[PDB]
């Protein structure tokens, strides 16, 4: 059952580390890309995607853009982009960590 890539972003939340929560879906599995203030985001140990383990009877995937120690330079606009052959989606939010 093929279907379009989809995304949802939630308000940034502090859970010891900081997390921009997200869910994605799609079949086939989508390509993901983050933007920060409109620039393609290059993940490092200070800002990386972390997924929850997938549930067995599901294609939906959940996770965080995770920031273990954000600073003022991490404040701004975050966009998540998802694509597969049957659709393409984008979501953005503002995050203030300081």
């Amino acid at each position: 059952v093929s279907f379009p890539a989809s995304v949802q972003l939630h308000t940034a939340v502090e859970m010891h580390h900081w997390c921009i929560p997200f869910s994605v879906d799609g079949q086939p599995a989508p390509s993901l890309r983050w933007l920060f203030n409109g620039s393609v985001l290059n993940e490092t140990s200070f800002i990386f995607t972390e997924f929850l383990e997938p549930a067995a009877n599901e294609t939906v995937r959940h996770g965080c853009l995770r920031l273990n120690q954000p600073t003022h330079v991490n404040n701004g606009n975050y966009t998540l982009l998802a694509a597969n052959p049957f659709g393409q989606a984008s979501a953005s939010i503002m995050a203030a960590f300081m």
Binding site: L32, R33, E43, F48, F51, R61
Partner: peptide, 14 residues
């Protein structure tokens, strides 16, 4: 792309 997942995550790629 992904810092944690150089080979994707269950088919999801960066």
């Amino acid at each position: 792309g992904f810092f944690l997942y150089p080979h994707g995550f269950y088919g999801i790629v960066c």
